[PDB]
Write an enzyme that holds these catalytic residues in place. Structure first.
Site, PDB file in Angstrom:
ATOM      1  N   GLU A  11       0.118   5.044  -3.660  1.00 22.75           N
ATOM      2  CA  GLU A  11       0.138   4.845  -2.246  1.00 22.75           C
ATOM      3  C   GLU A  11      -0.984   3.953  -1.776  1.00 22.75           C
ATOM      4  OE1 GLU A  11       3.513   7.177  -1.328  1.00 22.75           O
ATOM      5  OE2 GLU A  11       2.332   5.681  -0.325  1.00 22.75           O
ATOM      6  N   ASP A  20       4.548   0.558   6.307  1.00 22.63           N
ATOM      7  CA  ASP A  20       5.300   0.996   5.102  1.00 22.63           C
ATOM      8  C   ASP A  20       5.945  -0.166   4.467  1.00 22.63           C
ATOM      9  OD1 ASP A  20       7.152   3.836   4.718  1.00 22.63           O
ATOM     10  OD2 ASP A  20       5.496   3.473   6.142  1.00 22.63           O
TER      11      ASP A  20
END
Length: 164
Positions: A11, A20
């Protein structure tokens, strides 16, 4: 290697609101704030999440706090889920980590829809399941990450993450 280290490789860490792969507003270690297009809606969620006026920016400290909550929720969600729980229970420690990773990225619901692969993982048909998991939007959209997770389920070892 552990779940936290693995997810933090996947991440990354960003201390400023960001989008995102999906275009969604996120902060920290993959903490989705909103799926809404306003940065303003995102900022508001952020302040609600931290308990302060953040102005779109948080500390390392706050990032890890959110990350601890998120991992905890992912696990508890697996445990409460009728479709997920049995697979989780059946797996070894390392593969358990691979399932947690998928839940963190895509949510309970999303993973619970991989019916066929779940079935194969429970049966311990590692190579078959790895082939089936790759036939998904998930793999096509974030292939390097999907492939790391998939190797993990395939091998039951942390090699995909050694490199990284």
């Amino acid at each position: 290697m552990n779940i936290f280290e693995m997810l933090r490789i996947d991440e990354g860490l960003r201390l400023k609101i960001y989008k995102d792969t999906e275009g969604y507003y996120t902060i920290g270690i993959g903490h989705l704030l909103t799926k809404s297009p306003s940065l303003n809606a995102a900022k508001s969620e952020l302040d609600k999440a931290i308990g302060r006026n953040c102005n779109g920016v948080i500390t390392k400290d706050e990032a890890e706090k959110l990350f601890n909550q998120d991992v905890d929720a992912a696990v508890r969600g697996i445990l409460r889920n009728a479709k997920l729980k049995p697979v989780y229970d059946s797996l070894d420690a390392v593969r358990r980590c691979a399932l947690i990773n998928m839940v963190f990225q895509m949510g309970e619901t999303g993973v619970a829809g991989f019916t066929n692969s779940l079935r194969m993982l429970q049966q311990k048909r590692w190579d078959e399941a790895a082939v089936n998991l790759a036939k998904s939007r998930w793999y096509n959209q974030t292939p390097n990450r999907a492939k790391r997770v998939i190797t993990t389920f395939r091998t039951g070892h942390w090699d995909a993450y050694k490199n990284l």
